[PDB]
């Protein structure tokens, strides 16, 4: 029964004098609900889930203001980072930021996080204890010093410990129908003779939620982790997820292979065999 809320911010500079693009999106679990895009027409925190629309005029100002303040600080960061790494004003550069909170089966604080990247790699990160900083290079250290002096850790802490958890709850309660649902995988198995010798067996998990899951083939006892083609779990586009795992086998030996499906949403881990 664990839940989280995470925000994700990306800022990308443009060659020359052009304004940076800003994108923010927010998630409760595997469900996104807000977004902001500098490129888009509104100029506001726009809702992305139905149940967040219950929020009133003021709510939308607050998050609009707060997202613009987030953007103004990303805009400036890029300038500073372009300096700390003495990089020409020519190339594109990316700042990403992520923060959020987790509560457990009982809606009390579990953990919080705040992480910052520059150019696709760690730059500065709030530690688990939420009190101090890991700095990934002497430029991050300049920041680390600046952030200590302004008590940034205690500030985000308070946020992560306070309002972050309290809002997570309100969302859990007001998007009840979406957010606290468990969807077990709808499963099936496909078989295709791929030569005289061998066949493909493909085990599918469809329309599951949350996204976490394990599909693993076994032959007889010990398992096939190596000879398996597995895709990474993927959004269906309707708020659920798909995954599959395949294995190639000798024709007439398919009864020897078994697919294991684990998911919070199944009381017992399903096992599947090609049973045509």
């Amino acid at each position: 029964g664990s839940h989280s809320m995470r925000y994700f911010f990306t800022s990308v500079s443009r060659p020359g004098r052009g304004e940076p693009r800003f994108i923010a999106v927010g998630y409760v679990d595997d469900t996104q609900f807000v977004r902001f895009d500098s490129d888009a027409a509104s100029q506001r925190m726009e809702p992305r889930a139905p149940w967040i629309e219950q929020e009133g005029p003021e709510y939308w100002d607050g998050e609009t203001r707060k997202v613009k303040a987030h953007s103004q600080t990303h805009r400036v960061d890029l300038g500073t980072l372009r300096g700390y790494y003495n990089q020409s004003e020519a190339g594109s550069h990316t700042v990403q930021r992520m923060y959020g909170c987790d509560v457990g089966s009982d809606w009390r604080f579990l953990r919080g996080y705040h992480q910052y990247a520059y150019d696709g790699k760690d730059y500065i990160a709030l530690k688990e204890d939420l009190r101090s900083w890991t700095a990934a290079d002497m430029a991050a250290q300049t920041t680390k010093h600046k952030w200590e002096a302004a008590h940034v850790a205690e500030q985000l802490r308070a946020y992560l410990e306070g309002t972050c958890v309290e809002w997570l709850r309100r969302y859990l309660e007001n998007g009840k129908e979406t957010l606290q649902r468990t969807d077990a995988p709808k499963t099936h198995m496909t078989h295709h003779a791929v030569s005289d010798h061998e066949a493909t067996l493909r085990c599918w998990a469809l329309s599951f939620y949350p996204a976490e899951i394990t599909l693993t083939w076994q032959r007889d006892g010990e398992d096939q982790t190596q000879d398996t083609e597995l895709v990474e779990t993927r959004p269906a586009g309707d708020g659920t997820f798909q995954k599959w795992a395949a294995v190639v086998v000798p024709s007439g030996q398919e009864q020897r292979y078994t697919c294991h499906v684990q998911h919070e949403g199944l009381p017992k881990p399903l096992t599947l065999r090609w049973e045509p």
């Binding site: 809320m5 607050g62 998050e63 997202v67 600080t73 923060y99 910052y116 730059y123 300049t142 946020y159």
Partner: peptide, 10 residues
Amino acid sequence: FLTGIGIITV
């Protein structure tokens, strides 16, 4: 709910 504090320049 975006934090209103804790975000300042690097």
